[PDB]
Amino acid sequence: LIEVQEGKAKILIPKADSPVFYNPRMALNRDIVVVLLNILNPKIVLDALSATGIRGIRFALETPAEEVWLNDISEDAYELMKRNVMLNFDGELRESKGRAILKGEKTIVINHDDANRLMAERHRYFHFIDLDPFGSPMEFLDTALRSAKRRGILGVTATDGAPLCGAHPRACLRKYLAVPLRGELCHEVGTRILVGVIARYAAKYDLGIDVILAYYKDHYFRAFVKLKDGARKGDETLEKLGYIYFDDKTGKFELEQGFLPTRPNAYGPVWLGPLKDEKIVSKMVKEAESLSLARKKQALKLLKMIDQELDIPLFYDTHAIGRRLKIETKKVEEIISALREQGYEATRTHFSPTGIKTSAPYEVFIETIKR
Numbered sequence: 001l002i003e004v005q006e007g008k009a010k011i012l013i014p015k016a017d018s019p020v021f022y023n024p025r026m027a028l029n030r031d032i033v034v035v036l037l038n039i040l041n042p043k044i045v046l047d048a049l050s051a052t053g054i055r056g057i058r059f060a061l062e063t064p065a066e067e068v069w070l071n072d073i074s075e076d077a078y079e080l081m082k083r084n085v086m087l088n089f090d091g092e093l094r095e096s097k098g099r100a101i102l103k104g105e106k107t108i109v110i111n112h113d114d115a116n117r118l119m120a121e122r123h124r125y126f127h128f129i130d131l132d133p134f135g136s137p138m139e140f141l142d143t144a145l146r147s148a149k150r151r152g153i154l155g156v157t158a159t160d161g162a163p164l165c166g167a168h169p170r171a172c173l174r175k176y177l178a179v180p181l182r183g184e185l186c187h188e189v190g191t192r193i194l195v196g197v198i199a200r201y202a203a204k205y206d207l208g209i210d211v212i213l214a215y216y217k218d219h220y221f222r223a224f225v226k227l228k229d230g231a232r233k234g235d236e237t238l239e240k241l242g243y244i245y246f247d248d249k250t251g252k253f254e255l256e257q258g259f260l261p262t263r264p265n266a267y268g269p270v271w272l273g274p275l276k277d278e279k280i281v282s283k284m285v286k287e288a289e290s291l292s293l294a295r296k297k298q299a300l301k302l303l304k305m306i307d308q309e310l311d312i313p314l315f316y317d318t319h320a321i322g323r324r325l326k327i328e329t330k331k332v333e334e335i336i337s338a339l340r341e342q343g344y345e346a347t348r349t350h351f352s353p354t355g356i357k358t359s360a361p362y363e364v365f366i367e368t369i370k371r
């Protein structure tokens, strides 16, 4: 059992297969949540699957959250959670039947249980829930949508890019109830599928969603959504769903808005609405800068890219399109400059190193990239 530090938190992690899971590479993902929570200010928050407890501990130490819940089904994780919490906080941790509570400046609740059972007990209780599972979050989604306030925030992660990026089509249909698209656009389609499944599951509770921030990074998808209260809110949310058509011979895509597609070879359903709230993401860049984070340089690099990134469905991948059409292409920076000079919005995208988001028609893009 060695000690490590992440952000303002110091935790004990076992040494190697490990009894309690901890991934230092996820320090960035945790930094982004911290930044967002300092903008939204949720009071009651839940770290549904905390393992070592690092996420919830940082929520308590680095954000305005007043009541923080840490939960894990593993006995080992639970014991480690209590230890690391008391490693960062003073006081006596009162425990009773797989539940330990500390009532200090911040109220910390440590629970040993199935996330679905805990969330079912806390109906319409949390202002913010963070679902960070090992793989798919689908077995916890429906209950999280009932555990969060009707105007709460949901932070969702999916680490199984295989089905979301199209490698495992069958699994994607089973888990996400959507037809995935392979290729250069898969990182974004996977992200829009995640957001779209959250929107679809939310509808039955007469709730809609506004995406605060949804992105892809190092083989995992993240979606922060704000629940909207009302049947009409839910109707308008479903109206933002749609499908994608992809011509594998050219890289040209088409979009169809609607609950159901009306042509063959449709991919989706996917969320065709905004993948970010401009104002909030803009504020996150500033907030990240004024905060001490675990991976501050990587967090700013990602947030700045997303901040300047055009918020529009899909993009054109210079490399992939070049390979499909069998043509030579210009460099990305040369293409963006050329597109802007012609009056079209054009930016790079975090979804791909060679991707370009632009309002320009496919044909205009092709004429511009042709070298």
Ligand SMILES: C[S@@+](CCC(N)C(=O)[O-])C[C@@H]1OC(n2cnc3c(N)ncnc32)C(O)[C@@H]1O
Residues within 6 Å of the ligand: 020, 021, 022, 023, 026, 030, 048, 049, 050, 051, 052, 053, 054, 055, 071, 072, 073, 074, 077, 113, 114, 115, 116, 132, 133, 134
């Ligand atoms: C990759 S880890 C989570 C990490 C994290 N939240 C962070 O930033 O370190 C997911 C894990 O979820 C678990 N788990 C699996 N099923 C669960 C369930 N039904 N309820 C609560 N926890 C569960 C674990 O035992 C384990 O600690």
